[PDB]
Symmetry: C5
């Protein structure tokens, strides 16, 4: 369980949890823990979602909704991602920081 | 675990998590994760429930209650649905978006 | 897991989760999920508790405390009741609706 | 799982979860569930902790922090005590009620 | 499960969960439970994080964000640390108290 974090904002509205092609050989995940508003986040309900594809029709996984006045930070426990997995802001301007741990296995290279 | 979402509102007060009859042959579920108020949701306590039937007397499963000022979004973890399962708004006007993952198994069609 | 709900208020200050004597033969439970204030609930901290008996001295299990302005609804996860189990309002006027699922096993009556 | 509750306040700043010496022969616990402010609690952040001893240097286990305006009640799930275990108010005046279930095993005395 | 707590503030912006080299021989952890603002904490969103190192590029694990007016205290359940693990305040002035239990095994020294 290496440890992972990123942000989504108007400057980084989209992101991606992707593991290196060499590293992707193993089973890799990203077990998310928390999502917290950034310093430049607007006072509105910013929504973090995932972008993927199903049956050719565009789709996304809503992850969280945050607002500094009510819910600036929430616990994203029970949410895991199998890389590659795109990140997007369904709503808001960010920065919405997403935390977690990149679960990655490594072979014996000794 | 394909990934799933819908909304309930005055325009869609009722919905249903149903898997296709061909797909229903396998064990299908919908493990819910979160429920979040929509952009057009009223500032009141909107309640999301499920509609089913027991012993011929009408019944529903209350899923969540949300309000933009207090609890616009909640985590619907530990809630799973076996399709078909109707959705309804016990109270409110919506849109109340319900998230989750449609757990579906597929046979080898190669 | 049949599904269950009730309310406690000045009209129903006390209630009971009881399974029928014929049904009680099996192991029956009521896994609670959520507790939500009713439409007629006062703007105060209404407390839901259970009534039982220990060593002959009167006792109760506090389940929840709710207020429309702060915590109108809470998740009563991890709380399970073995029938019969009385319900009472430690404080408040209700209606405080208690949700859950009545876990009940049935024999083969074919 | 017998069921347990107590309060800590200026009148009862300290308490203890202790099982009777005769009962202590078995493995006894107190799985805590919730902590809620009392009727006489002040509008400040009252902190509930445990008192014990380690390596001869005084120590305590902070359990919770509550305030009527923000967090009058919280879920103390995942917290278990092995009796005897002293209770104290790290901060506040109480009453802070602590809930739970005293898990106790009994031999066959028939 | 010995029991553990510390604080991070302008006076202690950095800390560390480290087990003694003699004690480190066994598998040691620190299962965190809660994080609560101190008496001298400013009315802003103080962020607690961990400091470590990955692939030579500096990094940290954000643990929590707290504010007395909204979220003075939160439950840090599901978070565990393998010593040594540095603590830092990503934002804020503290004191932000971090609770938990130091899980430590000891050999038979009789």
């Amino acid at each position: 369980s290496l440890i992972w974090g990123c942000e989504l904002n108007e400057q980084n509205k989209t992101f991606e949890f992707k593991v290196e092609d060499d590293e992707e050989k193993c089973e890799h995940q990203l077990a998310l823990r928390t999502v917290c508003l950034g310093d430049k986040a607007k006072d509105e309900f910013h929504i973090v979602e995932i972008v993927t594809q199903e049956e050719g029709a565009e789709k996304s996984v809503p992850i969280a909704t945050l607002k500094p006045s009510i819910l600036p930070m929430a616990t994203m426990v029970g949410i895991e991602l199998t890389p590659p997995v795109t990140f997007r802001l369904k709503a808001g301007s960010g920065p919405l920081y997403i935390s977690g741990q990149h679960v990655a296995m490594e072979e014996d290279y000794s």
